[PDB]
Amino acid sequence: MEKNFVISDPRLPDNPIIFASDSFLELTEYSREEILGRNCRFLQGPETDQATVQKIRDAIRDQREITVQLINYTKSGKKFWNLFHLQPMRDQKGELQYFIGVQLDGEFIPNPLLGL
Ligand SMILES: Cc1cc2nc3c(=O)[nH]c(=O)nc-3n(C[C@H](O)[C@H](O)[C@H](O)COP(=O)(O)O)c2cc1C
């Protein structure tokens, strides 16, 4: 099965990526060594809806799962629609341990409907 996903450590400054799947590197055209320890916001760009980024920010604050569709950019500057699913991961004692984010590329919801 193909799966674009990255894993971040919220107990380190600014939620850095500590693991990225091979297909994520394939989709984003980045190498593994140039995104490790990065915040995933580097995928955003001029066309990224800031109102959608705000929804992600609130979901991380409240440590709840969320699904949004937003524009992301590859290393070479190509735009692609990203159906992004974020999920909190807790340990045996109920403490937040990781965030996992899954990316599906494609304009699943038509943008004229997404803008409403
Ligand atoms: C595990 C994880 C994966 C993420 N993946 C993406 C992503 O693929 N694309 C994206 O635009 N933002 C992604 N984000 C969100 C950004 O890292 C960041 O949280 C978002 O831009 C809001 O934070 P900010 O307002 O500080 O920039 C991800 C966040 C986490 C925790």
Side-chain angles (χ1 to χ4, degrees):
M1 178 152 188
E2 210 170 21
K3 265 274 149 271
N4 321 290
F5 67 94
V6 296
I7 299 165
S8 75
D9 190 352
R11 286 125 85 123
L12 296 181
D14 201 13
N15 231 333
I17 297 165
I18 62 170
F19 178 91
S21 70
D22 286 346
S23 273
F24 178 86
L25 312 173
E26 214 171 299
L27 164 77
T28 65
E29 301 169 3
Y30 287 92
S31 84
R32 181 170 268 108
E33 321 87 50
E34 71 191 302
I35 73 114
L36 276 198
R38 275 229 244 190
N39 189 283
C40 210
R41 72 172 62 84
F42 75 99
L43 294 178
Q44 297 160 16
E47 303 289 352
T48 303
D49 194 336
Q50 292 306 124
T52 307
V53 178
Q54 169 80 240
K55 284 175 184 167
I56 303 180
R57 190 178 310 117
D58 295 342
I60 291 173
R61 172 200 65 200
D62 300 341
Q63 298 175 8
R64 304 187 74 82
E65 84 170 60
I66 192 177
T67 299
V68 294
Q69 176 174 308
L70 79 172
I71 286 273
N72 280 172
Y73 290 71
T74 72
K75 182 180 180 181
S76 62
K78 173 169 58 200
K79 294 179 292 179
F80 70 95
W81 282 101
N82 180 6
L83 184 63
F84 166 61
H85 179 52
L86 179 83
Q87 183 130 354
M89 303 279 291
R90 311 192 167 265
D91 58 15
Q92 62 205 219
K93 292 165 199 315
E95 307 207 292
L96 180 69
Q97 191 180 354
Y98 307 112
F99 283 108
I100 177 167
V102 180
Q103 299 87 23
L104 296 173
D105 62 315
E107 190 187 348
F108 294 98
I109 311 113
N111 178 67
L113 300 173
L114 203 70
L116 302 173

